[PDB]
Symmetry: C2
Subunit: 241 residues, 2 copies
């Protein structure tokens, strides 16, 4: 049985309620956030609030494929969020391609693939992004990058492959949208690879379950929550608002 | 806002529904299980089915405190489950005391304490049990021990410290009961230590949110689910059944 989790629509409702009642928390800079602790939902839409930027996600994908820990290797102009989090030499931790494809992180993708190809029912089919040393590594050379994704586990049931995504922190507006596109990409790729290994498998992509320690919206995005609360629209221009 | 999760009572219901419907899965030996994938619930009871063995949990606690990776150092006679999972020299991976207190695993407890003592609002107060090299370490020297707990995050909100437990696999009967006792112990200790750091803090233990990739019952325990399904009693002797 796959758990009876909330949907993205229900998450929207709870975030609206949180704002309606001034359930604010003071983030590490000093800025307000609304927040759901221990959030768990099926990622059945590719965004919660805001709009889809397919161009950006594709650049972030190409960067993950390079497995480069330097933010300058992001195609084109490096986003400001990535450069203010980088070290003095432009280095970070959270290249998710490095996490699952580098041999430096013990070949997470390949090992999970080998595991599920040998035992489709495995409960140890898992990709481990973070590491114990992250307690010291997150601010190496003055970066500020404590890996937000901990683990992603894959479970094959009824010829559908489900992903259980475990994060410590995920921003509702930018974070979820980019990270969902990534996890959906990796899920689709794992299905293809397993199917190409044996044509009788016929696996299909299943559910992505999103587990977040702190799922939050920053105060600069409150107008999106507010507008949805009043109109049901998941996006406005900050000008039209 | 702390998420509106299922309770242990609701988990019991769903597990009963799964058995009622022969929703079985063939485990790695070859034995049936019922199962909830992507389970998330508030651990508001110290067990799901079965009875509390305080004597055993105390022996396992003492072993965790020793941080010993050898199963023979478990006080008294080593449980059969522990010795069939051990390597050829009696070694394992899953001493949770080693995981959070050993300097070999980068001082998970101490670093999380320092983090939360410095910033009570932190989203990076976290203890990382598992490691990337677990892909290769799980069967070192012929052991069979792929760490079941991935991470545990701590979030202090309204002077209550909530724990978000992320596991890939947890057996409903023996697993949850022992592991909950452990996580409750660590939560209580972290509250104490933070409170002893500053008398104006006045923190309290909050909720333990349990996230499991595969939450399962083995076929040898089906009779407990079956009995609860009929009578509402969470325990019977296999003789009285």
């Amino acid at each position: 049985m796959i758990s009876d989790s909330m949907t993205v629509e229900e998450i929207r409702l709870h975030l609206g309620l949180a704002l309606k009642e001034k359930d604010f928390v003071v983030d590490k800079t000093g800025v307000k956030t609304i927040e759901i602790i221990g959030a768990s939902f099926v990622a059945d839409e590719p965004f919660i609030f805001g709009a889809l930027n397919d161009e950006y996600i594709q650049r972030e994908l190409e960067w993950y494929k390079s497995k480069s820990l330097f933010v300058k290797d992001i195609p084109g102009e490096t986003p400001k969020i990535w450069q203010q989090v980088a070290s003095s030499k432009g280095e970070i931790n959270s290249n998710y391609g490095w996490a699952i494809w580098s041999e430096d992180n013990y070949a997470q993708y390949d090992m999970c693939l080998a595991e599920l190809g040998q035992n489709p029912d495995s409960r140890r089919g898992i990709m481990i992004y973070t590491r114990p040393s992250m307690q010291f590594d997150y601010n190496k050379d003055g970066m500020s990058d404590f890996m937000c994704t901990n683990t992603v586990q894959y479970l094959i049931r009824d010829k559908k492959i489900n992903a259980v995504v475990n994060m410590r922190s995920n921003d509702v507006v930018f974070g979820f949208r980019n990270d969902y596109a990534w996890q959906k990409y990796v899920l689709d790729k794992l299905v293809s690879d397993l199917n190409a290994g044996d044509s009788t498998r016929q696996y299909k992509a299943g559910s992505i379950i999103w587990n977040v320690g702190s799922l939050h919206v920053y105060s600069r995005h409150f107008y999106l929550v507010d507008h949805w609360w009043k109109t049901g629209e998941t996006h406005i221009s900050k000008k039209d608002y």
